[PDB]
Design a protein around this motif. Structure first.
Motif, PDB file in Angstrom:
ATOM      1  N   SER B   7      -4.449   1.953  -5.921  1.00  0.00           N
ATOM      2  CA  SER B   7      -5.238   2.803  -5.035  1.00  0.00           C
ATOM      3  C   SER B   7      -6.273   3.602  -5.821  1.00  0.00           C
ATOM      4  O   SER B   7      -5.995   4.068  -6.927  1.00  0.00           O
ATOM      5  CB  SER B   7      -4.321   3.753  -4.260  1.00  0.00           C
ATOM      6  OG  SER B   7      -3.299   3.040  -3.589  1.00  0.00           O
ATOM      7  N   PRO B   8      -7.477   3.767  -5.248  1.00  0.00           N
ATOM      8  CA  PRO B   8      -7.864   3.227  -3.945  1.00  0.00           C
ATOM      9  C   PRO B   8      -8.722   1.969  -4.077  1.00  0.00           C
ATOM     10  O   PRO B   8      -9.571   1.718  -3.227  1.00  0.00           O
ATOM     11  CB  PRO B   8      -8.707   4.360  -3.382  1.00  0.00           C
ATOM     12  CG  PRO B   8      -9.474   4.831  -4.598  1.00  0.00           C
ATOM     13  CD  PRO B   8      -8.548   4.616  -5.797  1.00  0.00           C
ATOM     14  N   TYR B   9      -8.495   1.198  -5.134  1.00  0.00           N
ATOM     15  CA  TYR B   9      -9.269  -0.017  -5.375  1.00  0.00           C
ATOM     16  C   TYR B   9      -8.808  -1.166  -4.484  1.00  0.00           C
ATOM     17  O   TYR B   9      -9.613  -1.797  -3.800  1.00  0.00           O
ATOM     18  CB  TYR B   9      -9.184  -0.421  -6.847  1.00  0.00           C
ATOM     19  CG  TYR B   9      -9.709   0.634  -7.794  1.00  0.00           C
ATOM     20  CD1 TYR B   9     -11.039   0.638  -8.193  1.00  0.00           C
ATOM     21  CD2 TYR B   9      -8.876   1.625  -8.291  1.00  0.00           C
ATOM     22  CE1 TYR B   9     -11.523   1.597  -9.058  1.00  0.00           C
ATOM     23  CE2 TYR B   9      -9.351   2.590  -9.158  1.00  0.00           C
ATOM     24  CZ  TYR B   9     -10.675   2.572  -9.538  1.00  0.00           C
ATOM     25  OH  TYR B   9     -11.153   3.529 -10.398  1.00  0.00           O
ATOM     26  N   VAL B  10      -7.506  -1.437  -4.500  1.00  0.00           N
ATOM     27  CA  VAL B  10      -6.926  -2.470  -3.649  1.00  0.00           C
ATOM     28  C   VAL B  10      -5.591  -2.007  -3.073  1.00  0.00           C
ATOM     29  O   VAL B  10      -4.616  -1.827  -3.804  1.00  0.00           O
ATOM     30  CB  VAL B  10      -6.719  -3.790  -4.414  1.00  0.00           C
ATOM     31  CG1 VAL B  10      -5.984  -4.799  -3.541  1.00  0.00           C
ATOM     32  CG2 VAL B  10      -8.052  -4.353  -4.878  1.00  0.00           C
ATOM     33  N   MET B  11      -5.559  -1.810  -1.760  1.00  0.00           N
ATOM     34  CA  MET B  11      -4.362  -1.321  -1.088  1.00  0.00           C
ATOM     35  C   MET B  11      -4.017  -2.194   0.112  1.00  0.00           C
ATOM     36  O   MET B  11      -4.873  -2.893   0.651  1.00  0.00           O
ATOM     37  CB  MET B  11      -4.566   0.125  -0.628  1.00  0.00           C
ATOM     38  CG  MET B  11      -5.039   1.063  -1.723  1.00  0.00           C
ATOM     39  SD  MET B  11      -5.609   2.646  -1.078  1.00  0.00           S
ATOM     40  CE  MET B  11      -6.954   2.115  -0.020  1.00  0.00           C
ATOM     41  N   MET B  12      -2.756  -2.149   0.528  1.00  0.00           N
ATOM     42  CA  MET B  12      -2.315  -2.884   1.705  1.00  0.00           C
ATOM     43  C   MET B  12      -2.742  -2.151   2.971  1.00  0.00           C
ATOM     44  O   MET B  12      -2.384  -0.989   3.175  1.00  0.00           O
ATOM     45  CB  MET B  12      -0.797  -3.060   1.690  1.00  0.00           C
ATOM     46  CG  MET B  12      -0.278  -3.851   0.502  1.00  0.00           C
ATOM     47  SD  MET B  12      -0.833  -5.565   0.510  1.00  0.00           S
ATOM     48  CE  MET B  12      -0.039  -6.173   1.995  1.00  0.00           C
ATOM     49  N   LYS B  13      -3.513  -2.829   3.816  1.00  0.00           N
ATOM     50  CA  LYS B  13      -3.974  -2.244   5.068  1.00  0.00           C
ATOM     51  C   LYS B  13      -2.793  -1.786   5.917  1.00  0.00           C
ATOM     52  O   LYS B  13      -1.669  -2.257   5.735  1.00  0.00           O
ATOM     53  CB  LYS B  13      -4.827  -3.247   5.848  1.00  0.00           C
ATOM     54  N   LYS B  14      -3.052  -0.861   6.837  1.00  0.00           N
ATOM     55  CA  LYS B  14      -2.009  -0.320   7.701  1.00  0.00           C
ATOM     56  C   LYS B  14      -1.164  -1.428   8.322  1.00  0.00           C
ATOM     57  O   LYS B  14       0.001  -1.607   7.964  1.00  0.00           O
ATOM     58  CB  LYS B  14      -2.620   0.552   8.787  1.00  0.00           C
ATOM     59  N   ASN B  15      -1.759  -2.169   9.250  1.00  0.00           N
ATOM     60  CA  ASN B  15      -1.068  -3.274   9.903  1.00  0.00           C
ATOM     61  C   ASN B  15      -1.252  -4.585   9.148  1.00  0.00           C
ATOM     62  O   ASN B  15      -1.702  -5.582   9.713  1.00  0.00           O
ATOM     63  CB  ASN B  15      -1.543  -3.423  11.351  1.00  0.00           C
ATOM     64  CG  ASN B  15      -3.052  -3.515  11.464  1.00  0.00           C
ATOM     65  OD1 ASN B  15      -3.767  -3.489  10.462  1.00  0.00           O
ATOM     66  ND2 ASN B  15      -3.547  -3.624  12.693  1.00  0.00           N
ATOM     67  N   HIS B  16      -0.898  -4.580   7.867  1.00  0.00           N
ATOM     68  CA  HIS B  16      -1.049  -5.759   7.024  1.00  0.00           C
ATOM     69  C   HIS B  16      -0.093  -6.871   7.441  1.00  0.00           C
ATOM     70  O   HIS B  16      -0.327  -8.044   7.155  1.00  0.00           O
ATOM     71  CB  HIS B  16      -0.824  -5.402   5.553  1.00  0.00           C
ATOM     72  CG  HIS B  16       0.596  -5.061   5.224  1.00  0.00           C
ATOM     73  ND1 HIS B  16       1.525  -6.013   4.865  1.00  0.00           N
ATOM     74  CD2 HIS B  16       1.245  -3.874   5.201  1.00  0.00           C
ATOM     75  CE1 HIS B  16       2.686  -5.428   4.633  1.00  0.00           C
ATOM     76  NE2 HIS B  16       2.543  -4.128   4.830  1.00  0.00           N
ATOM     77  N   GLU B  17       0.987  -6.493   8.116  1.00  0.00           N
ATOM     78  CA  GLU B  17       1.979  -7.459   8.576  1.00  0.00           C
ATOM     79  C   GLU B  17       1.445  -8.282   9.742  1.00  0.00           C
ATOM     80  O   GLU B  17       1.895  -9.402   9.984  1.00  0.00           O
ATOM     81  CB  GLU B  17       3.266  -6.754   8.966  1.00  0.00           C
ATOM     82  N   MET B  18       0.479  -7.718  10.463  1.00  0.00           N
ATOM     83  CA  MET B  18      -0.122  -8.399  11.602  1.00  0.00           C
ATOM     84  C   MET B  18      -1.428  -9.078  11.206  1.00  0.00           C
ATOM     85  O   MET B  18      -2.155  -9.591  12.057  1.00  0.00           O
ATOM     86  CB  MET B  18      -0.353  -7.420  12.743  1.00  0.00           C
ATOM     87  N   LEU B  19      -1.722  -9.073   9.910  1.00  0.00           N
ATOM     88  CA  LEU B  19      -2.944  -9.682   9.399  1.00  0.00           C
ATOM     89  C   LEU B  19      -2.641 -10.748   8.351  1.00  0.00           C
ATOM     90  O   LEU B  19      -1.514 -10.860   7.872  1.00  0.00           O
ATOM     91  CB  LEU B  19      -3.872  -8.617   8.814  1.00  0.00           C
ATOM     92  CG  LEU B  19      -4.456  -7.613   9.805  1.00  0.00           C
ATOM     93  CD1 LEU B  19      -5.215  -6.516   9.079  1.00  0.00           C
ATOM     94  CD2 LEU B  19      -5.354  -8.316  10.813  1.00  0.00           C
ATOM     95  N   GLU B  20      -3.661 -11.528   8.000  1.00  0.00           N
ATOM     96  CA  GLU B  20      -3.514 -12.578   7.000  1.00  0.00           C
ATOM     97  C   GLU B  20      -4.800 -12.757   6.201  1.00  0.00           C
ATOM     98  O   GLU B  20      -5.849 -12.223   6.564  1.00  0.00           O
ATOM     99  CB  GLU B  20      -3.114 -13.887   7.662  1.00  0.00           C
ATOM    100  N   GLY B  21      -4.711 -13.505   5.106  1.00  0.00           N
ATOM    101  CA  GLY B  21      -5.863 -13.768   4.266  1.00  0.00           C
ATOM    102  C   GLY B  21      -6.358 -12.536   3.535  1.00  0.00           C
ATOM    103  O   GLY B  21      -5.568 -11.769   2.983  1.00  0.00           O
TER     104      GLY B  21
END
Lengths: 82, 97, 261, 143, 48, 46, 48
Positions: B7-21
């Motif tokens: 952080s804050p360069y590369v982080m897991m988005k909030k709803n990363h479980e509902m996203l892909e790629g």
């Protein structure tokens, strides 16, 4: 980029281009300050506050009791000499 | 494109479980990747480095680890992350400005 | 246009004031008023030991008079001096602090325009979750409105409301901590509705206008157009607005008191 | 001497005056610290409810003809005043009107188009300001 | 319309000062000067 | 009583302390208005 | 260095080597702060 890669030169120039377009500075501001939550120049721009405590006034209380004690000492000696 | 979770360069988005790629990630480097890809003209796939290290060299085995490693051993094509430009690395890989 | 309008700001009716002797115990903390009284009798008792049961009462009342503030017995002499220096500092502190409570009281400034919403953060603000109002800030390339959108775009919790009623309710229940941006026309009307706790501030953010719509290439086209112009010049349009907004409204009372100020 | 009765009276009265003189001192410090400029206004209705501050418009133009033909409550009274106000509250040009406002020490107000007014406010010596909303709704257009 | 307008009011710019000893009665309100005088004689009568 | 010599001494000393206590009060008010709290100093050397 | 020069890579690494040895920082201190001089106006600017 891997030594002797094709993306080598292109990416290099790309970085320079992004910085000159202020795009790099923009990105940093986006994730550091804009997306931030704290504040320093805003806490100083916040003209609001007021309330008395006791700390400062307390220091004057101790010097008072100290004076009373000094007198209680000067009193005792006076009665002794007499 | 190899990168590290920092952080804050590369982080897991909030709803990363509902996203892909690449939509799963967000951050400074995530945006910097899209920008670089736009000016260089190429599609990319954001991938997180296995061991989750940057780029060091074990004295004994003489093996590179982290992103710098995945570059030397052909695991990735490019590294977009807060990778420090050091002499020890400039010898094995190439660093842009 | 038969009525020019724009985007306005809606805040919660502000007002308050009172005296109470508790504005004297504030500058000087309740804890401090106490100790200054404990030390008060703490000196009238020390002096009392300097000077049969009634003789002690008459003296305790004399030292209490030497307490109730205004020969060379060095003992109790330095007591009167130190106690004087003590009260000197306190009354000086009270005076200085009281000056600050009035200086800061003036420092406080109320929102006068939109730029005021961007320069501060204490008071949250938002628009309707869907409509030209919200889309305005999003697409606006103007300096002030830009920053405003940037804030509202990522403000948490959501500064946007579902309906106009929800927005007004949010302004009436936030004690002046939330401002709502909406069409001036609807805003001005709300200000004239019970409990008369909302008011429009500053001028509009943009210039819009309503008009009579007629099918392209209609016969009523030109006639109606001229009719609107005729009505406005006869002050008939302004008259109608006054009839439904202010006359039919119910607030010339909160406006007569807002005259001053 | 130590007449306890009137004694506490002198003490309480002293504490009373102490607070007051302290309040006076503190309060007096405030005006001289912040020192924010004032201004009397603004809703036109304010011009009709009072007479101390004179006011007028251009001797010729839509501005003057507006009040004359206006059948609105407030604007009616305003015109009645300006129509018989002595000396003449009307000026020859817009420059004369502005000059009258700058030389009357706030005793004379001038009514004009908001557009030109807003512009004047942004001109040296920056001694004029527009107050309240517009009296009517107009608009320029491409002819 | 490319610009909506109307008739406005133009007044001087508040900024100046004046005397009249009334800048001393302001800090302390006229109402307060009164009561401090009423209590003034209110004490001189109690002592009396 | 009216010993002119030491008399003006008491008067001048009173005017002296008057100014000081007035200065203390005024200055303390400034302090209670702004009330700015600095800190250490930026400099690895510090 | 001219595009496609022989001194290219060598000089590049040399710069990196100098910086890591703190030689670059040292040089700057030598000509900016040490070379002074002031060296006095900075000790008074401490803001005590």
């Amino acid at each position: 980029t891997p030594k002797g890669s094709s993306l080598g030169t292109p990416v290099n120039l790309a970085v320079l281009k992004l910085s000159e377009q202020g795009l790099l500075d923009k990105l940093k501001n986006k994730w550091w300050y804009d997306k931030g939550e704290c504040g320093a120049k805003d806490s100083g721009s916040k003209e609001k506050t007021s309330a008395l405590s006791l700390s400062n006034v307390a220091g004057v209380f101790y010097i008072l009791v100290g004076g009373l004690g000094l007198a209680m000492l000067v009193a005792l000696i006076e009665f002794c000499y007499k | 494109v190899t990168t590290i979770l920092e952080s804050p360069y590369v982080m897991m988005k909030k709803n990363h479980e509902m996203l892909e790629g690449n939509e799963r990630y967000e951050g400074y480097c995530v945006d910097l990747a899209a920008e670089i890809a736009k000016h260089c003209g190429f599609k990319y796939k954001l991938t997180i480095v296995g061991d989750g290290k940057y780029g060091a060299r074990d004295a004994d085995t003489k093996i590179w680890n982290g992103m710098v490693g995945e570059l030397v051993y052909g695991k990735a094509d490019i590294a977009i992350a807060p990778l420090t430009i050091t002499l020890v690395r400039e010898e094995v890989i190439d660093f842009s400005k | 246009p038969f009525m020019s309008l724009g985007i306005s700001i809606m805040i919660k009716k502000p007002q308050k004031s009172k005296p109470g002797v508790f504005s004297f115990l504030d500058p000087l903390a309740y804890e401090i008023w106490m100790c200054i009284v404990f030390a008060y009798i703490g000196v009238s008792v020390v002096l009392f030991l300097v000077s049969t049961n009634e003789f002690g009462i008459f003296n305790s009342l004399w030292f209490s008079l030497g307490a109730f503030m205004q020969p060379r017995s060095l003992s109790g002499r330095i007591v009167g001096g130190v106690w004087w220096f003590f009260t000197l500092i306190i009354i000086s502190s009270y005076t200085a602090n009281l000056a600050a409570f009035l200086t800061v009281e003036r420092m406080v400034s109320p929102i006068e325009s939109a730029e005021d919403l961007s320069k501060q953060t204490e008071i949250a603000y938002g628009t309707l979750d869907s409509g030209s109002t919200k889309e305005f800030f999003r697409r606006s390339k103007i300096a002030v409105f830009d920053k405003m959108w940037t804030y509202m775009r990522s403000a948490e919790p959501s500064v946007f409301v579902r309906t106009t009623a929800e927005g007004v309710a949010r302004v009436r229940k936030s004690k002046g901590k939330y401002a709502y941006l909406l069409e001036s026309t609807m805003n001005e009307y709300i200000e004239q509705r019970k409990p008369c706790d909302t008011m429009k501030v500053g001028g509009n953010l943009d210039s819009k206008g309503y008009g009579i719509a007629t099918p392209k290439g209609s016969s009523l086209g030109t006639p109606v157009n001229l009719a609107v112009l005729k009505l406005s010049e006869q002050g008939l349009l302004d008259k109608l607005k006054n009839k439904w907004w202010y006359d039919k409204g119910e607030c010339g009372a909160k406006d007569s008191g807002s005259k001053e100020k």
